[PDB]
């Protein structure tokens, strides 16, 4: 079935990211965008899965954080292009949990604070860009998140969730 073909496409994009042949993976990336033009749901779900796995993966060594920086930059820009090219028509509706699955890593690993700014200042820029291009479609989940955390500010003054959550209102 062609779903096996598209999953092979996404994995064929994927294997370069444990490493981090350039022209081949560039053609693969533009093919990813062309497929995400028609059906982006499974593409986005797979990209969330891959990005969550990569950022969740714990590796060490100077070349290892260089690899993480380069890989996360690549994933962020590819996700940005696929998110921007998605509305070929007026199709704004996305599943709320699919946004919510995308939500936490983007909302935290660049916006708990300025994280790795000497390398990840532009990563923060790219995260803000994908967050804007997401909230132009389905901001209502994020808006509900903002309301719920403000409600969560109940009593105790020992809360640092504002830099984690309220600052997201900026972008």
């Amino acid at each position: 079935r062609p779903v096996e073909w598209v999953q092979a496409v996404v994995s064929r994009f994927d294997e370069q990211l444990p490493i981090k042949t350039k022209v081949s993976t560039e053609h693969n990336k533009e093919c990813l965008i062309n497929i995400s033009k028609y059906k982006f749901s499974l593409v986005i779900s797979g990209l969330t899965t891959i990005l969550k796995n990569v950022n969740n993966m714990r590796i060490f060594g100077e070349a290892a954080e260089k690899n993480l920086y380069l890989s996360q930059l690549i994933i962020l820009d590819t996700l940005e292009k696929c998110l921007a090219g998605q509305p070929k028509d007026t199709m704004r509706l996305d599943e709320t949990m699919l946004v919510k699955q995308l939500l936490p890593e983007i909302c935290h690993f660049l916006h708990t604070c300025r994280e790795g700014n000497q390398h990840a200042a532009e990563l923060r820029n790219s995260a803000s860009g994908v967050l804007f291009s997401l909230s132009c479609n389905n901001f209502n989940a994020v808006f509900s998140r903002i309301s719920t955390r403000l409600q969560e500010l109940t009593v105790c003054s020992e809360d640092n969730v504002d830099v984690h959550d309220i600052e997201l209102l900026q972008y």
Binding site: R1, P2, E4, W5, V6, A8, V9, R12, T21, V23, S24, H27, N28, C31, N34, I35, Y38, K39
Partner: protein, 464 residues
């Protein structure tokens, strides 16, 4: 036959025979005859005729003819054809000046007696010799050849040892090949043998495939020379001769999965498609010539030019394209589906860069042109494309692959228009099975009894 010494002795015998044939005053030949015999002696001295005679690696036959003083290689009947034709040339050249020598009559009788009686060690050779030498043939002789073919088929079916009967089948086919042009044009057999040829192509044996292709080639050339194609298509006359005994051929078509009833030209291309998987390239070139002459006949029947894309001629263009696609030309879904299946087979089996590239670039366009019937050929390219999509680092191959992927992903809204089993709706199935590579077992497929019954019905209708 035999060890090195006897084969070298046979070669020395041939050389001494020609040598004494030219250097004797008893025969008093002409000068030009002596010239052609002198040429023949030189051509037998060549290493090519060493390899024909089975002696390889040996510099001098005369040295090892006497080597004691001081079987591994197989034998192929085409070498015997070349040797017998050379000897026939020599014998003809010498009998031209000799009045009423009657040598050829004696040799034909000596061939006839050994050819038509049962002897497994000698009958395959005697059949080929009688084919090459004879200058006349009758209905009874060729029908005896067909009966011998049928009996060899039955013996190959019942017997575990098959090589001996296969050799006889191959010799039978090439004897038919040599004997067809001498036959009178009024015999219907001139057409009927065509079906016999494709029957051999169903027997998926390498030497049998080569012999069937040779029979088909000479049949097409001779039958074109007798001008039966002047007013009629290759479709019409062959279904006219296959009209009575079609029931057995109906079971045959059900088993092979290719119906000549519905689509004649796409049936023939399915058979001839195995030629590209033959190991020897000469058979490949012969198949190309077969496709070319059929394309010319089909196009000139409709008074168009060569390379003219139309309904009937599109299959030959698809086959020859490896060595445009117009929807307005090909409106029917069945024909365009079969056209897609041909390309899917050729991309599945062939594994060379240029051909898979040109066929992928052709196939991407057909996905745009014919998206509804394009799922039918999905599975035939399901694995291979994926494998390339995994490990093709060359951009030029993966770009049409990406185009095909995007074209299918866009058009996934309506699967149930057609399925991969739609080909089983009518007859055509296994067109990917029949174009597969040659099997190592090379065992004859049963339904060969149906071939036996088919040949028997041929004899029963046309001989008496």
């Amino acid at each position: 036959t035999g060890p090195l010494s006897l084969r070298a002795s046979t070669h020395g015998l041939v050389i001494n025979i020609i040598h004494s044939l030219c250097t004797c005053s008893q025969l008093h030949f002409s000068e030009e005859t002596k010239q052609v015999l002198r040429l023949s002696l030189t051509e037998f001295s060549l290493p090519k005729f060493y390899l024909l005679f089975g002696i390889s690696k040996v510099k001098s036959a005369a040295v090892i003819a006497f080597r004691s003083s001081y079987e591994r290689e197989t034998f192929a009947l085409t070498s015997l054809e070349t040797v017998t034709e050379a000897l026939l040339e020599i014998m003809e050249a010498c009998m031209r000046d000799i009045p009423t020598c009657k040598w050829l009559d004696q040799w034909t009788e000596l061939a006839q007696r050994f050819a038509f009686q049962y002897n497994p060690s000698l009958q395959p050779r005697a059949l080929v010799v009688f084919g090459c030498i004879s200058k006349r043939v009758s209905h009874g002789q060729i029908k005896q050849i067909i009966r011998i073919l049928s009996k060899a088929l039955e013996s190959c079916l019942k017997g575990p040892d098959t090589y001996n009967s296969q050799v006889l089948i191959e010799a039978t086919v090439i004897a038919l090949t040599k004997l067809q042009p001498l036959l009178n044009k009024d015999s219907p057999l001139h057409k009927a043998l065509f079906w016999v040829a494709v029957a051999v192509l169903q027997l998926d044996e390498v030497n049998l495939y080569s012999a069937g292709t040779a029979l088909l080639e000479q049949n097409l050339h001779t039958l074109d020379s007798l001008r039966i194609f002047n007013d009629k298509s290759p479709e019409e006359v062959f279904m006219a001769i296959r009209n009575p005994l079609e029931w057995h051929c109906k079971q045959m078509d059900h088993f092979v999965g290719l119906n000549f009833n519905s689509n004649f030209n796409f049936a023939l291309v399915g058979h001839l498609l195995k030629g590209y998987r033959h190991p020897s390239p000469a058979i490949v070139a012969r198949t190309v010539r077969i496709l070319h002459t059929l394309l010319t006949l089909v196009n000139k029947h409709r008074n168009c030019d060569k390379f003219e894309v139309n309904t009937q001629s599109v299959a030959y263009l698809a086959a020859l394209l490896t060595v445009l696609l117009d929807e307005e030309v090909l409106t029917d879904p069945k024909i365009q589906a079969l056209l897609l299946t041909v390309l899917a087979t050729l991309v599945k089996y062939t594994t060379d860069e240029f051909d898979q590239r040109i066929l992928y670039e052709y196939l991407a366009e057909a996905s745009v042109v014919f998206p509804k019937v394009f799922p039918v050929v999905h599975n035939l390219l399901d694995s291979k494309i994926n494998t390339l999509l995994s490990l093709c680092q060359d951009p030029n191959l993966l770009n049409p692959i990406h185009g095909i992927v995007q074209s299918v992903v866009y058009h996934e809204e309506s699967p149930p228009q057609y399925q991969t089993s739609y080909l089983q709706s009518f007859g055509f199935n296994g067109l990917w099975r029949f174009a597969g590579p040659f099997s190592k077992q090379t065992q004859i497929p049963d339904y060969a009894e149906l071939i036996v019954k088919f040949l028997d019905a041929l004899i029963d209708t046309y001989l008496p």
